């Protein structure tokens, strides 16, 4: 499933070429979203010592992350 | 207060943090003014049944029993009301807010027929 | 048997709503106008965070 | 703060546009009764539109938040079921 | 710039590439033979060097 | 249900950056963030409702993700493939 598709999810929740750049600009935002609140998941999984990150982890990397945003 | 712009920008200035950054700007959709609409005539509706359910009988002895004059003052109102509803929905009409509202986020029949959906589980599973 | 729902909706329909639309009708009663929508006005100002949903439930 | 923003829009629209307007319409109308009770009724409109406009704006906020908490009430109802 | 990424030049950077010279550096880069690294020494520099294309490890 | 995504999306979305960052997920994380990305979706769509030129940018420079437009077109390089990321470059 490619960034394009990801573009095509967003555009179908907001309903031309321009619009499309603006579209996979904003689905690479997303994924980068989505590495940097992983990367903090593992940051705080391995300061507490565990192999695996957890749902209690990213959720307060996550709100530490929404806190400074 | 008519100038519903200024209004509008001042109360977002005025409650939300220093550090949210309010920098677009939309004016609010059709399925925005459908359910404004909607609960202002529901709302209404209730209102003038309850007021003229409450001052029946001033009406009555002052017409001295003439229901048709009560029924032209009725349509007099239900004129006045729409036509007062017709100057807000163009006044809103330029107006400013955030597009993440849908019909569904402001609607009070639905998210009560929820609410008591929810409530009838938690008696059901609290009686089982 | 149902005792929770018969409980919640005797609270909501005539300890809240009841009260509400007493307390309106009787201030509006009491002569006049400006003297209940100023008076409701408090009483709806230090009644917050009490007469909430959750508070009922 | 879009339902705040809202019903401030609506008190400030209410309380000093329609009600003030048909009060002092109520206190001119003081040679025919027929007028100042329809004034007064008038007057009976907009506030009981205001008032419905703020309850009704803190009830969706009230139960929108409300349901979330019963919802969490839910959940822990049915842990205890499944334990017991 | 091309003489001192062939000769290997360890004091290349982002700072002597121009603004003229930036699309010539994003063709660089999309061609993904370039190690992009930020300094230790001094954060924000990213020092530029092309891969080893003679190694046989 | 047809607004939130699917655990199998979130799966061919970023299993190579689990896989190349050692990151080891079970399901109850990977339904945690597929109800994640529905508030990340409502959060971005709220800082950023329509979009302009420099608006973005200065939302992303806002956002602490990036200091410049190197670091827009430097980001979408390791997110796209090269046609997609060449379109991007001519776009900006």
Same mark, same amino acid.
């Given at each position: 499933?490619?960034?394009?598709?990801?573009?095509?999810?967003?555009? &179908?929740?907001?309903?031309?070429?321009?619009?499309?750049?603006?579209?996979?600009?904003?689905?690479?935002?997303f /994924? %980068?979203? $989505?590495?940097?609140?992983?990367?903090?998941?593992?940051? &705080?999984?391995?300061?507490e010592?565990?192999?695996?990150?957890?749902?209690?982890?990213?959720?307060?990397a996550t /709100? %530490?992350? $929404?806190?400074?945003? | 207060?008519?100038?519903?712009?200024?209004?509008?920008?001042?109360?977002?200035?005025?409650?939300?943090?220093?550090?949210?950054?309010?920098?677009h700007?939309?004016?609010?959709?059709?399925?925005?003014?459908?359910?404004?609409?909607?609960?202002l005539e529901?709302?209404?509706?209730?209102?003038?049944?309850?007021?003229?359910?409450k001052?029946?009988?001033?009406?009555?002895?002052?017409?001295?029993?003439?229901?048709?004059?009560?029924?032209?003052?009725?349509?007099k109102?239900?004129?006045?009301?729409?036509?007062?509803?017709?100057?807000?929905?163009?006044?809103?009409?330029?107006?400013?807010?955030?597009?993440?509202?849908?019909?569904?986020?402001?609607?009070?029949?639905?998210?009560?027929?929820?609410?008591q959906?929810?409530?009838?589980?938690?008696?059901?599973?609290?009686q089982? | 048997?149902?005792?929770?729902?018969?409980?919640?909706n005797?609270?909501?329909?005539?300890?809240?709503?009841?009260?509400?639309?007493?307390?309106?009708?009787?201030?509006?009663?009491?002569?006049?106008?400006?003297?209940?929508?100023?008076?409701?006005?408090?009483?709806?100002?230090?009644?917050?965070?009490?007469?909430?949903?959750?508070?009922?439930? | 703060t879009?339902?705040?923003?809202?019903?401030?829009?609506?008190?400030?629209?209410?309380?000093?546009?329609?009600?003030?307007?048909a009060?002092?319409?109520?206190?001119?109308?003081?040679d025919?009764?027929?007028?100042?009770?329809?004034?007064?009724?008038?007057?009976?409109?907009?506030?009981?539109?205001?008032?419905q406009?703020?309850?009704?704006?803190?009830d969706?906020?009230?139960?929108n938040?409300?349901?979330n908490?019963?919802?969490?009430?839910?959940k822990?109802?049915?842990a205890?079921?499944?334990?017991? | 710039?091309?003489?001192?990424?062939?000769?290997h030049?360890?004091?290349?950077t982002?700072?002597?590439?121009?603004?003229?010279?930036?699309?010539?550096?994003?063709?660089?880069?999309?061609?993904?033979?370039?190690?992009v690294?930020?300094?230790?020494?001094?954060?924000?520099?990213?020092?530029?060097?092309?891969?080893?294309?003679?190694?046989?490890? | 249900?047809?607004?939130?995504?699917?655990?199998?999306?979130?799966?061919?979305?970023?299993?190579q950056?689990?896989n190349?960052?050692?990151?080891?997920?079970?399901?109850?994380?990977?339904?945690?963030?597929?109800?994640?990305?529905?508030?990340?979706?409502?959060?971005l769509?709220?800082?950023?409702g329509?979009?302009?030129k420099?608006?973005?940018?200065?939302?992303?420079?806002?956002?602490?993700?990036?200091?410049?437009?190197?670091?827009?077109?430097?980001?979408?390089?390791?997110?796209?493939?090269?046609?997609?990321?060449?379109?991007?470059?001519?776009?900006?």
């Amino acid at each position: 499933m490619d960034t394009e598709a990801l573009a095509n999810y967003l555009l &179908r929740q907001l309903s031309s070429s321009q619009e499309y750049n603006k579209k996979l600009l904003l689905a690479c935002g997303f /994924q %980068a979203i $989505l590495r940097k609140i992983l990367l903090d998941a593992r940051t &705080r999984a391995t300061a507490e010592g565990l192999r695996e990150v957890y749902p209690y982890h990213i959720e307060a990397a996550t /709100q %530490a992350f $929404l806190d400074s945003q | 207060p008519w100038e519903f712009r200024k209004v509008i920008q001042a109360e977002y200035r005025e409650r939300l943090p220093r550090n949210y950054e309010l920098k677009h700007w939309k004016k609010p959709s059709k399925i925005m003014i459908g359910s404004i609409l909607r609960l202002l005539e529901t709302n209404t509706v209730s209102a003038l049944d309850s007021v003229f359910e409450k001052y029946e009988k001033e009406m009555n002895q002052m017409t001295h029993g003439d229901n048709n004059e009560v029924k032209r003052i009725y349509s007099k109102k239900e004129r006045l009301l729409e036509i007062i509803l017709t100057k807000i929905k163009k006044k809103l009409r330029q107006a400013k807010f955030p597009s993440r509202i849908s019909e569904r986020d402001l609607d009070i029949e639905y998210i009560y027929s929820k609410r008591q959906f929810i409530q009838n589980r938690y008696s059901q599973e609290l009686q089982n | 048997t149902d005792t929770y729902n018969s409980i919640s909706n005797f609270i909501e329909n005539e300890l809240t709503a009841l009260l509400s639309s007493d307390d309106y009708l009787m201030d509006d009663l009491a002569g006049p106008n400006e003297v209940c929508r100023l008076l409701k006005a408090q009483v709806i100002e230090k009644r917050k965070d009490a007469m909430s949903r959750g508070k009922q439930d | 703060t879009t339902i705040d923003v809202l019903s401030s829009l609506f008190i400030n629209l209410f309380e000093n546009d329609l009600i003030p307007q048909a009060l002092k319409d109520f206190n001119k109308s003081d040679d025919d009764q027929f007028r100042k009770l329809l004034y007064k009724l008038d007057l009976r409109l907009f506030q009981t539109i205001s008032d419905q406009m703020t309850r009704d704006l803190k009830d969706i906020l009230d139960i929108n938040v409300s349901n979330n908490e019963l919802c969490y009430q839910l959940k822990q109802v049915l842990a205890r079921k499944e334990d017991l | 710039l091309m003489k001192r990424l062939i000769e290997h030049d360890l004091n290349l950077t982002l700072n002597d590439f121009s603004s003229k010279t930036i699309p010539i550096y994003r063709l660089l880069l999309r061609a993904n033979i370039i190690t992009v690294i930020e300094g230790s020494t001094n954060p924000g520099t990213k020092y530029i060097k092309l891969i080893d294309f003679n190694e046989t490890s | 249900s047809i607004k939130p995504l699917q655990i199998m999306d979130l799966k061919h979305l970023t299993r190579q950056f689990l896989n190349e960052n050692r990151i080891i997920l079970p399901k109850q994380t990977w339904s945690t963030i597929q109800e994640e990305s529905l508030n990340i979706m409502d959060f971005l769509k709220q800082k950023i409702g329509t979009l302009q030129k420099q608006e973005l940018v200065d939302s992303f420079i806002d956002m602490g993700i990036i200091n410049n437009v190197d670091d827009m077109f430097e980001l979408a390089h390791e997110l796209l493939p090269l046609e997609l990321q060449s379109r991007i470059e001519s776009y900006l």
